[PDB]
Design a protein around this ligand. Structure first.
Ligand SMILES: [Mg+2]
Ligand SMILES: [Mg+2]
Ligand SMILES: [Mg+2]
Ligand SMILES: [Mg+2]
Ligand SMILES: [Mg+2]
Lengths: 120, 79, 559, 205, 128
RNA sequence: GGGAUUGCUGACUGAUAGUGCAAACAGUACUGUGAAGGAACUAAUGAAACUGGGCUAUAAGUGCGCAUUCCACCAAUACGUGAGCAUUCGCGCAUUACCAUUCUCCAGAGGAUUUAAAUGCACAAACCUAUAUGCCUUUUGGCAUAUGAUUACACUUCGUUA
């Protein structure tokens, strides 16, 4: 039914969905999941599909691997995940390259690996 | 969808119906008397104070052979 | 946008055109491992044109962890666009190769050589001798003492790549030792079978066989293999030892050192049925024919396997399987019945002439004397004699004549053109004389009129005597006997005297000389005329042939 | 005949013509059958082939001198018969006969008499179809003979990179520096070399 | 091999369910369509004993209505379909029995459902 | 699903039909600022309306051109080319001549009817382009697991020498 409910989107939710489809690979997507809010009216013949908009913050994480801070856009729950499994270094090492659906996470991942390898 | 791809398809479509300018091309040929179209000339200089200066190295030079008189090859071969 | 993303997008390209785009638009954006990943993903993305034969209906579990669900048809060709894009991309990769070869380890070079060997196998590039040397240097300089660089898998992949590439290398003499150093430590069973296949097709390593037998036997079973790998192991031991045993195949036997491994392989291949291909069982049956290995219920299972796919088999595979079940003496009645019905329902029954000769021999030396087999041997004989226009060898005619002489083939109009083509090819470089002796045995299985090559066979045998570089076997007097009994020239007694003076043959060949002693110039010179009288061979017409040389032998030949 | 022309399937897939030009033929059908003639020209059309014979299918042609009204002259002319309407006359009984394409020795194909012994004396000779030779009427001015036109003048032995083959002539060295035997003096006269020379001479005087 | 079987140009247009006829009527062996009498579900206090006894009986449909239902294709032999399960030896592999799903019977709209219950077809409301 | 060759494919159409177009130049002339709309026209024959005058007042032959099958040269494995109306109740094209005798309304205008044929229409045949279990499918994809985020590994082996 989901392929139907995407086609039943109100124009603000549809424009927000197009922007989500454009700028997904620009921000960190650790455990982030987009969601539709379809509300069910009991006096029937009305199913209004919308979007549950994610919340975004520009947190400045300190990398304990290489001596700098990086700024990068995240959600609350992926910040929970990163700061509750060990930090940016442990996340960028132990989450390999495909659960990262993100470009700056991949770039800082390569910089952590290269700087750490030259640090050996 | 790109700009160059559309222009190339337009030129390939215009490759057909080509030759001696029939149809709409007869009226469209008169655009050269309406919008100052630049022809296929080679530029020989540039304006500095509004006076044109021909650069002498861009003047036309034709490397004609030493003698084309009593040269033993003609434009026609005998059958 | 980064380099690990480029590596992972090369690895998960899922189409060869996508990989072509990534290689072409990011030429300066590469490094060593990007090129290595591109070469690794090259042979996996080739596609074939509609001749993909499904195996989902044959094995209930679809993959044993790695296979293609549709294997191929024998003789299938690639898609034309995919072949063009793959060849252009491989030329692009060979262009981008030496700028990044310097930072390689033995792993990347091993995978590159193996993958380009796969591309040569598929027919993409077929040459590869543009730049193969810098890869050899980067995998050989850092593996001279088995140094800190990688090992184990890379030896098998490098040697498999050189197996598929050939090239007649120099580091075989260097890599003789680190290969045999490291079987028993860091090689799996598939690595062992690729390495023994590569040593087989380079014909290089004979002391490496029995330790590899012991190593892959001390592994928990051979059941961690899959049936084409078992077929390659049989083929490897065939091409490395069976030609040694046969040349210092119905008389071929095994040696006791390798039979336990051969039984382990046969038990594995009968355990892993529902997974086995016609080419695999063709090579397995041929290797068991060559090695002289006669297992119980193994050819029954392999004949059942080719019975289960007989509309899907090309006639080369069927002819190979029927030869390997004819040389190794075995009867498979459903397979013979199905093959006979299949090419008796076929209205225009032509194929390659060697396949006709192979089916003729297979039905000849096996107990198929039913009416359907007589109709089949007549049909195959007519379809072959319609196409004796080959200048290859008399060997195809030799198998055809062995099949026609095992039967009592008496159809004269076939045998006339068979004899005409035999004498037409006989003036050229005929390799052997038994290849003519089979034709003579066929042409005297039934009645024939073949003087025009009987004189030529006499000329060839006198030429072999004048050469003085032949066997002078009892088959020499067997060549003498047929042309002697049909022809009468008188110069043929020199061979029958000189070879019989150095005889090395006791019975059933001096009777041939005694029966041929009327047409030749030898009147009566035989100490063995009484020894054959004490032997009573009773194969030739010696009773009517001893009526002019030894009257006691005339009674001894028939009574 | 049919008036469509393009609906007709094109005949003569293998190009072989039993009737040739300049030969005696018998008219089989039409306003004059039983008469004979000599073929003047065969119109080899794959869809509608015609044959024009000598003075048989005569119809008046209204040749139109260009004019709006009735100003024209009329000339009798042989109308084209269909190719199928005619057949070759054998020289023995004067009746029409079928020509076959028999092969004689040397691999050549000739036109025989349709007999079970097709050999010499049954071959009908076919004349050549071309005689436009400009070889007679050659050697006019502005022409070159074939032997002169086939000279092997070109050789790749020379033409190698020669950046210093200048010889230092004002612009006759510019062409062999850009990669040339002799420029005409008139060509160098076109790019005037005397504008600065006159100013130099006037300053000197 | 000019075998032309026109797979396209076959639409398989949907036919109406007529689900409102399932539990109300039933067909007998002779072909007669029977139904239970109405006016018996509630308000039984305001009715006489003979009237309530009379309304418990079933009556056949009138011939005109029965003819329309028979032509429409109504052939229901049972009030509700007997479950293929509940037969001994024919039971669910993992379900202890199954979930029944009691069914409702309202369906009437002039745009989409039940063309039998509307005189004409109403066009939709502006489609957003 | 899509894009081009072939159809001894068509109880498809035959010029107001069939594509919008069978045509020297049809997505043309022309219309519109523009996006966009969008014609007519084959070759003969020459119906009616209309308007003047007059009046009344022998299901056959014969030629060509091919296709089928025979033959003899063949790449020698599907036919490869070539003599032959040799063969076929084959196909296409070409061709078949009457000679009076006046009691027929005539002249124009117009382009219907009749005849002819796919380059039109619909498909068909090869050709090229585009992971497994089960739920819902509905000319096909959404959902958990497994060889799995990994730059690495099995297979098309031609065998023939009693
Ligand atoms: Mg039309
Ligand atoms: Mg019209
Ligand atoms: Mg229309
Ligand atoms: Mg007309
Ligand atoms: Mg009229």
């Amino acid at each position: 039914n989901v392929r139907q409910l995407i086609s039943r989107l109100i124009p603000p939710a549809r424009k927000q969905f197009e922007h989500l489809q454009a700028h997904r690979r620009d921000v960190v997507w650790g455990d982030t999941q987009i969601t539709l809010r379809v509300r069910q009216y009991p006096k029937s013949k009305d199913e209004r599909v919308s979007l549950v908009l994610p919340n975004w913050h520009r947190v400045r994480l300190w990398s304990e691997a290489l001596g700098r801070k990086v700024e990068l856009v995240m959600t609350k729950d992926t910040l929970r995940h990163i700061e509750d499994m060990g930090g940016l270094d442990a996340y960028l090492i132990k989450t390999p390259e495909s659960r990262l659906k993100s470009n700056p996470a991949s770039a800082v991942k390569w910089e952590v690996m290269s700087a750490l390898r030259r640090r050996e | 969808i790109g700009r160059e791809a559309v222009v190339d398809l337009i030129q390939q479509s215009a490759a057909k119906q080509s030759g001696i300018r029939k149809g709409w091309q007869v009226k469209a040929a008169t655009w050269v008397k309406r919008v100052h179209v630049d022809r296929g000339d080679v530029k020989v200089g540039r304006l500095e104070g509004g006076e044109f200066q021909v650069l002498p190295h861009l003047r036309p030079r034709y490397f004609v052979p030493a003698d084309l008189d009593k040269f033993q090859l003609k434009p026609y071969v005998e059958v | 946008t980064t380099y690990t993303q480029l590596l992972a997008s090369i690895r998960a390209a899922k189409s060869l055109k996508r990989l072509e785009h990534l290689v072409d638009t990011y030429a300066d954006r590469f490094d060593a491992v990007h090129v290595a990943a591109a070469v690794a993903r090259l042979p996996h993305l080739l596609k074939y044109r509609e001749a993909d034969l499904v195996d989902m209906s044959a094995s209930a579990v679809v993959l044993p962890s790695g296979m293609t669900r549709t294997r191929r048809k024998h003789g299938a060709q690639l898609r034309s666009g995919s072949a063009e894009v793959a060849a252009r991309l491989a030329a692009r990769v060979d262009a981008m190769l030496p700028q990044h070869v310097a930072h390689f380890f033995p792993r990347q070079a091993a995978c590159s050589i193996w993958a380009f060997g796969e591309l040569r196998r598929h027919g993409v590039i077929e040459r590869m001798d543009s730049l193969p040397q810098v890869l050899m240097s980067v995998t050989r300089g850092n593996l001279q003492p088995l140094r800190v660089h990688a090992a184990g898998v890379d030896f098998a992949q490098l040697l498999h790549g050189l197996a598929k590439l050939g090239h007649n290398d120099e580091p075989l003499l260097d890599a003789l030792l680190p290969l045999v150093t490291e079987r028993l430590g860091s090689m799996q069973q598939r690595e062992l079978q690729m390495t023994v296949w590569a040593l087989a097709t380079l014909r290089r390593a004979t002391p490496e066989l029995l330790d590899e037998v012991a190593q892959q036997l001390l592994s928990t079973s051979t059941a961690f293999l899959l049936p084409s790998a078992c077929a390659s192991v049989f083929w490897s031991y065939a091409k490395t030892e069976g030609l040694a045993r046969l040349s210092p195949r119905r008389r071929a036997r095994v040696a006791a050192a390798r039979v336990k491994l051969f039984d382990s392989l046969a038990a594995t291949m009968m355990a892993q049925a529902l997974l086995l291909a016609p080419q695999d069982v063709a090579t397995t049956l041929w290797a068991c024919s060559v090695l002289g290995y006669h297992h119980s219920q193994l050819p029954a299972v392999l004949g059942d396997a080719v019975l289960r796919a007989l509309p899907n088999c090309s006639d080369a595979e069927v002819a190979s399987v029927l030869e390997s079940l004819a040389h190794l003496g075995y009867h498979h009645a459903p397979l013979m019945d199905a093959v006979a019905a299949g090419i008796l329902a076929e209205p225009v029954v032509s194929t390659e002439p060697v396949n006709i000769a192979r089916v003729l021999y297979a039905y000849g030396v096996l107990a198929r004397r039913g009416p359907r087999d007589l109709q089949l041997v007549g049909t195959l004989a007519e379809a072959l004699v319609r196409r004796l226009a080959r200048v290859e060898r008399l060997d195809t005619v030799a198998l055809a004549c062995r099949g026609l002489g095992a039967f009592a083939y008496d159809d004269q109009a076939v045998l006339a053109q068979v004899a005409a083509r035999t004498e037409q090819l006989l003036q050229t470089s005929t390799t052997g004389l038994e290849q003519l002796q089979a034709v003579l045995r066929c042409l005297d299985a039934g009645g024939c009129s073949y003087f025009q090559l009987a004189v030529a066979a006499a000329r060839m045998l006198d030429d072999r005597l004048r050469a003085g570089a032949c066997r002078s076997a009892p088959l020499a007097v067997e060549v003498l006997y047929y042309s002697a009994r049909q022809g009468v020239x008188x110069x043929x007694x020199x061979x029958x005297x000189x070879x019989x003076x150095x005889x090395x043959x006791x019975x059933x060949x001096x009777x041939x000389x005694x029966x041929x002693x009327x047409x030749x110039x030898x009147x009566x010179x035989x100490x063995x005329x009484x020894x054959x009288x004490x032997x009573x061979x009773x194969x030739x017409x010696x009773x009517x042939x001893x009526x002019x040389x030894x009257x006691x032998x005339x009674x001894x030949x028939x009574x | 005949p049919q008036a469509l022309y393009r609906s007709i399937q094109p005949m003569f897939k293998t190009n072989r013509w039993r009737i040739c030009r300049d030969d005696l033929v018998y008219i089989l059908s039409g306003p004059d059958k039983g008469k004979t003639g000599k073929v003047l020209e065969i119109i080899k059309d794959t869809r509608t082939p015609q044959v024009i014979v000598e003075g048989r299918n005569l119809r008046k042609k209204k040749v139109k001198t260009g004019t709006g009204p009735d100003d024209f002259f009329v000339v009798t002319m042989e109308a084209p018969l269909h190719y199928s309407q005619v057949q070759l006359v054998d020289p023995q009984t004067g009746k029409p006969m079928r020509v076959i394409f028999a092969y004689t020795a040397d691999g050549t194909k000739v036109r025989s008499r349709k007999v079970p012994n097709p050999s010499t004396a049954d071959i009908i000779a076919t004349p050549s179809e071309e005689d436009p030779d400009p070889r007679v009427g050659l050697t006019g001015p502005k022409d070159t003979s074939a032997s002169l036109a086939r000279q092997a003048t070109y050789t790749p032995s020379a033409g190698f990179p020669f950046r210093v083959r200048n010889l230092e002539r004002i612009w006759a060295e510019l062409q062999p520096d850009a990669d040339x035997x002799x420029x005409x003096x008139x060509x160098x006269x076109x790019x005037x070399x005397x504008x600065x020379x006159x100013x130099x001479x006037x300053x000197x005087x | 091999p000019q075998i032309h079987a026109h797979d396209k140009y076959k639409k398989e247009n949907p036919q109406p369910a007529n689900s409102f006829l399932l539990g109300r009527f039933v067909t007998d062996r002779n072909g007669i369509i029977w139904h239970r009498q109405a006016n018996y579900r509630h308000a039984r206090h305001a009715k006489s004993a003979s009237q309530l006894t009379r309304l418990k009986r079933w009556k056949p449909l009138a011939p005109a209505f029965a003819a329309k239902l028979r032509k429409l294709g109504f052939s229901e032999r049972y009030w509700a379909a007997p479950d293929p399960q509940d037969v001994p030896g024919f039971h669910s592999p993992r379900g202890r029995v199954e979930r029944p799903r009691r069914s409702a019977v309202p369906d009437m709209d002039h745009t989409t459902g039940e063309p039998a219950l509307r005189q004409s077809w109403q066009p939709p409301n502006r489609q957003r």
